[PDB]
Enzyme design. Structure first.
Site, short mmCIF file in Angstrom:
data_model
loop_
_atom_site.label_atom_id
_atom_site.label_comp_id
_atom_site.label_asym_id
_atom_site.label_seq_id
_atom_site.Cartn_x
_atom_site.Cartn_y
_atom_site.Cartn_z
N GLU A 99 67.43 14.53 -17.98
CA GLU A 99 66.80 14.35 -16.68
C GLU A 99 65.76 15.43 -16.39
OE1 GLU A 99 69.49 11.39 -14.43
OE2 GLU A 99 67.46 12.08 -14.24
N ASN A 134 59.68 8.36 -7.91
CA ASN A 134 60.23 7.07 -8.29
C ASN A 134 59.38 5.93 -7.75
OD1 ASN A 134 62.37 8.15 -9.74
ND2 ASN A 134 63.32 8.74 -7.85
N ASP A 143 60.36 3.23 -5.88
CA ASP A 143 60.63 3.03 -4.46
C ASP A 143 59.81 4.00 -3.59
OD1 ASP A 143 62.72 5.52 -3.96
OD2 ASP A 143 62.74 4.71 -5.95
N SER A 201 60.52 7.27 -3.40
CA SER A 201 61.26 8.51 -3.28
C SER A 201 60.91 9.33 -4.51
CB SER A 201 62.78 8.28 -3.24
OG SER A 201 63.28 7.97 -4.54
N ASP A 206 62.38 12.53 -7.31
CA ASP A 206 63.55 13.19 -7.88
C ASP A 206 63.25 14.68 -7.91
OD1 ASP A 206 65.29 11.26 -8.05
OD2 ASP A 206 65.24 10.98 -10.19
N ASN A 215 67.02 12.40 -5.95
CA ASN A 215 66.04 11.79 -5.07
C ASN A 215 66.24 12.17 -3.60
OD1 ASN A 215 67.25 9.78 -3.22
ND2 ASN A 215 68.15 9.05 -5.08
#
Length: 129
Positions: free
Chosen positions: A35, A46, A48, A50, A52, A59
């Site tokens: 990650e 992201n 959507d 949002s 991270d 997020n």
């Protein structure tokens, strides 16, 4: 700050992630390896909308406030700028919460697609703990 592997493994162990909710150290290491590459200054917008944040990739839609993600909850009660610091105390205090939603570590897709069911103790192999 880019944490080494065994370097990180030790920061978690003492922060209380070694067997938290029943997940060993190995799962945690794998999580952030895929990650962020142990990078704590790592971020990723992201789809959507949002973003991270952190070495655990968290997020701002459901866990932190970044001041730009509408529909924020901020269930961790933080700013997402705090999950970038070199000190992983806030990224650990928040990870526990996420893994206690009822999904476990399934929360992290990377773990459900790269660490779950594999030899993850190999991620702490050779580390002095």
């Amino acid at each position: 700050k880019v944490f080494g592997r065994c370097e990180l493994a030790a920061a978690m162990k003492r922060h209380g992630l070694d067997n938290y909710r029943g997940y060993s150290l190995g799962n945690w290491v794998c999580a952030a390896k895929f990650e962020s590459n142990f990078n704590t200054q790592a971020t990723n917008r992201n789809t959507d909308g949002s973003t991270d944040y952190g070495i655990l990739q968290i997020n701002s839609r459901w866990w932190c406030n970044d001041g730009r993600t509408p529909g924020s909850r901020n269930l961790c009660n933080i700013p997402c700028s705090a999950l970038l610091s070199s000190d992983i105390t806030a990224s650990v205090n928040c990870a526990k919460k996420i893994v206690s939603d009822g999904n476990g570590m399934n929360a992290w897709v990377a773990w459900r697609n790269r660490c779950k069911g594999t030899d993850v103790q190999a991620w702490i192999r050779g580390c002095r703990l």
